[PDB]
Each structure stands twice: as structure tokens, then as C-alpha cells.
Design a protein around this ligand. Sequence first.
Ligand SMILES: Cc1ncc(COP(=O)(O)O)c(CN[C@@H](CS)C(=O)O)c1O
Ligand SMILES: Cc1ncc(COP(=O)(O)O)c(CN[C@@H](CS)C(=O)O)c1O
Lengths: 358, 358
Amino acid sequence: VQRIYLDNNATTRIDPKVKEIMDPFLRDHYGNPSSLHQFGTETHPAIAEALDKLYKGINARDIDDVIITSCATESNNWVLKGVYFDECLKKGKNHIVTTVAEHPAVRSTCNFLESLGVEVTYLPINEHGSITAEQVREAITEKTALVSVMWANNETGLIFPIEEIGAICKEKGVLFHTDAVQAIGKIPVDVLKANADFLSFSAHKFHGPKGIGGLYIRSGVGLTPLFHGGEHMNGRRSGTLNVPYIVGMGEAMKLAVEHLDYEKEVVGKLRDKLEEALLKIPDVMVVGDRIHRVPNTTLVSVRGIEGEAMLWDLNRSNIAASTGTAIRLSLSRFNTEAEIDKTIEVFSQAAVRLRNIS
Amino acid sequence: VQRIYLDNNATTRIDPKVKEIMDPFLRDHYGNPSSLHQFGTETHPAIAEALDKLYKGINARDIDDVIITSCATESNNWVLKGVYFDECLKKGKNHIVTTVAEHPAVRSTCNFLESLGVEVTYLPINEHGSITAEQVREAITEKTALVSVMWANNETGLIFPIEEIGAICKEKGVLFHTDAVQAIGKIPVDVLKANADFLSFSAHKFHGPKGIGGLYIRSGVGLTPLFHGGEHMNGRRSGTLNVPYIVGMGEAMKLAVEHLDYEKEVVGKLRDKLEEALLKIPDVMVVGDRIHRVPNTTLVSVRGIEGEAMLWDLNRSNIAASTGTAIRLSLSRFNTEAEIDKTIEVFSQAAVRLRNIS
Ligand SMILES: Cc1ncc(COP(=O)(O)O)c(CN[C@@H](CS)C(=O)O)c1O
Ligand SMILES: Cc1ncc(COP(=O)(O)O)c(CN[C@@H](CS)C(=O)O)c1O
């Protein structure tokens, strides 16, 4: 059979080169990097190269930290609860601003902080489907410890004005965190232009393995650890290093930035080919804005057939996509134009054989 | 070259069968298990088998939870901070008892809770090098939310009276957590006989990969999540599942319990062969008790040559061990008797060529 994977915002395929670079640390180089003997120090060069790739991947400075976590969910929980202890309980700055579009890893923890008594405002989305930076200004008070706005939305793909928000946050002296998981390998990511204090990411969204993530912490910014133990990662996150996934995520970051032109020029062009081909069908319509979007995502809406039935039909035809009432289709570098023509055909055939209402 | 690995309490080698069972989920079965399409549901049988192996591995009941974490450090932070929020701030039961022998992942977080105002007593070790259960009784008051005592010590190998402590905790109605990482695959582990409410473990101590762990939570016991997001693991720990490491850790648990007789009868006998051979040397001495110890560990002390110099010498001879002022040697199933004879020889040769003081 020949299956079609169009659900790359849910997770991606590991690049074969990433798997290859991970194998030796799953095989004979099994030493704990904290060990003083040769099995330990033997792993250090590859770790340094992976970390270097990550730094260079997000234009982090050598003075900055890029701490290895187990996923973006860990990074988000760590920023929000850490800044809860440092600035809300200890500095009395009991206010956090975020958006309604953030991943549940951010919003649900924010709900928990509300249950403890922190006041959090979830900014409402506007009609163009994005946020404006002035919205955060209107919501930022002199008691705001942190603003957290995702770089790109996972359901629709829209890119948010992180740069301008970073300038506002910089002028007013409030910590800035951005969940950028959906941005890596899709668009250029620069922590300096964003003036970000915190940045989240997760490997399996740019063709690394599930179960490893990263939190960029800018130099000097404090954040009480979520994993206490104080041994690893400059004492900020304890636990024996996931050596294979660290190297793999480094190579995956490298490949992701090396493929940016291909992502925008080829993957984005196929997304436009696909989208335009699908909009040649009755009362369908893209949900959201079509200009300020990441190159890989289209979010299509159909008449009165709910999206989940169409997704059942496609999976029956071995074509994988996700929801977002609407259908989210998210591409990658490993899709081909033949795959897109076939998906246009199967989508139409499924659509007319679903239209038969009653 | 032929290197000798005797540092298995720091981390272990991945069993080749574990790597094999992980490869397909690093290759073509890359779907997010939360996805509704075939790439997602396609991973479910292997996940169920791995989880089943874990449950059966620690005699957990089907009514219980065995939540997948990213390491034992995550499990320990989660128990202590979770029980801090549920019973100390909300139920006013502001007291925790633990030991001075616990891993830094437990003790350092306990220090953090003290900084927030929780009163924690770290029980002192006695001369036989172990704790008695009555010590915890004397320290347990009507304001104790939780007692946390490790199953086996990582530096010395001594097995603690978890069973009896579980009975005391059960009679008095205080939550019981045990960090059992060093016990899995070394001695039988039974959460029911221990009457444990929480149990920690980490895969890479029984020949699985670094970067995945487990927290057993007994049925009905509450614990506010450390990873909020509420999607995965019955909403208790959010983040896209580390599919390959879950399957591998399941197979690793299976092999670990299947090798218990071999661990005590063969690995323990080689540890006794080695130990007795090394005690035939001047003013040396095993640090700690020699009866109630895990089968794989010996902790040897030498005259006035510090242990780190001896460890430098051994690593120069491609023999790996760790500290514990003393030298910790920790075996596994993949060591051979030839390896042990050679280590006895190299240890002696290093010892006499280190004795030359000034
Ligand atoms: C009992 C016990 N509990 C927790 C840990 C930490 O495991 P992690 O998977 O790295 O989080 C360890 C790991 N002890 C190693 C590495 S610090 C040692 O050198 O002794 C342990 O022995
Ligand atoms: C922006 C953003 N931030 C965090 C996460 C969570 O990543 P983790 O590595 O699983 O913790 C995701 C993952 N969103 C997937 C799985 S819930 C989706 O279906 O949209 C994300 O898109």
C-alpha cells in the first residue's frame, strides 16, 4: 500500500539521518555523561555538537542557556510555574497575560495558577484570526510578571507578531515567553529579534523523536527549576541526559534550518497547489487568514458534513489528517506532488460520496 | 580493546532485544498515539503490551496507574510537589519525613519545600548502614502528609524495610512513596506487599534507555499533575508519548524480572567472588553492611589513597567504576567471570603501584 501522511503538526517522521546519528548511542556508547570515566566523557563531543546545533538553530548566544527538556509541555509548565514562584509569590507581581489560542500545556497550567489565586487574562482572537501587539499592551499592567504568546498556532498555522510583542515587553520590563514549537523548520526563528526571555520547542515537530524538547532561557533571567536535583543542565533541570535524543534533536534542528527555503518555496507551493485545487469545490472555505500563515498548513471547512466523517473516510483510504468542525491538513518536506494530486482526487471523491445527505 | 563496565548503578547498557523492539517506532511507525487515524491507532497494541509488562513487573493492579514519565527525577519531583499542594497547603498536613540517603532528586526538592515553609525531617542513618521502621514511627506525627524512603541505596546497595514501613504508614493513614529505581531487576518488587501509594523508577537502571521513567500511583490516591495539559496518561501527565522508549522500557522490565534468579545467583555470586578476592588485600574494608544488600553492589574502601585516584587508574586501564572517599563497584548480567578475575588483578596492580606514598 502507499499511504499519505498530511498530519505533520501532530507529529512528524524522524529523518533517517537523525535515526542514523542516534543509533550508536543506543548501541555501544551507553555511558552516563555525568560519569568521570571513559564511558562518560566519551559522549561529550557529540553532546556539544548537538547543543551547538540547537544554539545556532535559534540564534541563541553562547551566554544564553538552551536547556534540554523531555518535551515542550515540560518547557511550558516550567516557565509558567517557575515564574509563578519567582515573580508572583516573591516579587508580588501576580499577573500573567496569554492568549486563547495557546496549546493546552500553557492554558491548563494557567488555569491551575488561577486556582491558586493568580489573575490571568486570556486574550481573545480577532476576526483576521491573529493577535495584535497593542492588545497585549492594553492588557499589560504594572503587575504583569510574564506575557506568553505562541509563535505559530497549531490548528490554523497563523504567525503572530512576536517581534513587536518582544519590543513592547522589553520597553515595559515584563518577562516574555513564546511557545515556538510549530515555527521550527517552518519559518526562521531568532530569539534575539524576538527579545524573548523564554522559548519552547519540541523535537518531534521538526523530524526528531517524540519525548525531548527544549527551553531557551536568555542569560541572567532566573527560573526556579521544575526538576530539582541540581546536577545536570547547569543545575536547572535534573535527570540523566537522554543522550540519543539529544544528538538526534541537534541533527534534526540542523536539517530543519537547512530546509527553510525548501519549506517555504516547495512545501508551501504544494500547500498552495493543494489548497487552490480544493477550493474549486462547492461551499468550502479556508478557516482563517491566508497570508500570514506558516508554509505547511491549510485549514479547510466543508458544508454540513462534520470534519471527523471526512477524516474517517480519508483514513479508510490511508490518508492521514487531523481536526482544527474543520479539517487541518499539514505538510512536510517528504510529501511529493503526486501525493498532492492524489489527495485532491480522494478529497473530492470522498466529498461527493459524503454529500448524499439522507 | 576489551573494556570492563562495572558502573551499572550510574546507568546500564541497553539490552539488544530492547533496541530491536524500539527500532520500528524510530522508523516507519511514527504516528502520534493521540491521532485518530491509522498512524495513531496503529501504535496502540505495542503500547498496551509495554504498559502491561510494566504493571506485571511491579505487581501493579489493573485498577492502579503506572504513569509514564521522562525519568525517575520527574517522578520524585512530581510526588513531593504534588503532595505539597494537595496535603500541605490544602489539607494543612504540613510535614514530610524522608532519609538522608535519598537521591538528590528527592532531597533537593524537599529543601525547596522547606524554603516555602514546609517542615521536613531527614532521618539519620544508623551504624548498620540502613534505616529501621520504628525510626519513621518516632518521626511520624499527626501532621505528616508523606513518608518517602528509597527501596535500595544507590551508593551502597542496602535494601531498606519498605514492607514494614508500608504497614506503619497504612496503620497511621499517611501517604507512602518509595524511590525504587535501584531495586528493579535486582530484587523482587511488589507494590502491594509494600502498601506503596507512590513508586518511582527509571528505565536506564534496568537496561532500558535514558530519558524515560515511571511513577506507579495506587488507585484512588490523588496527585495534582506536574505536567498540566490533561490530555495524556489519564490527564495526569501531558505531552506526546515517547512511543519507542515506552515499548523498550516495557521489554526491559520484562527481561529484568525474568533475570531475577540469574541476578541473585550469578551476578551476586560474581560480586561475592570479586569482593572476597579484593578483601585479601591490606587495610581495605567494605563500607557498610554485607547481608541486606542488593546482589550487584560492593562499596570498597582503601587506606589513604583517595578513591578517585584509583578510579583514574582503572579508567586508564579501560575499567569503569564510580565513587560512593570510597569506590563503588556495581555489576550486571553482561559481566563474565573472566572480567572479574581481570578486575581483581588490575585492582591489585593499581593498588600496589598507588601505595608508593611520596
Ligand atoms: C535511586 C535513584 N533515584 C533517582 C535517580 C535519578 O535517576 P534519573 O533517571 O537520572 O532521574 C537515580 C540515579 N542515580 C545515578 C545518577 S545521578 C547515580 O549516579 O547514582 C537513583 O539511583
Ligand atoms: C505549539 C505546541 N506547543 C506544545 C505542544 C505539545 O508538544 P509536546 O512535545 O507533546 O509536549 C504542541 C503539540 N501539539 C500537538 C499534540 S497535542 C497537536 O496535536 O497540535 C504544540 O503544537
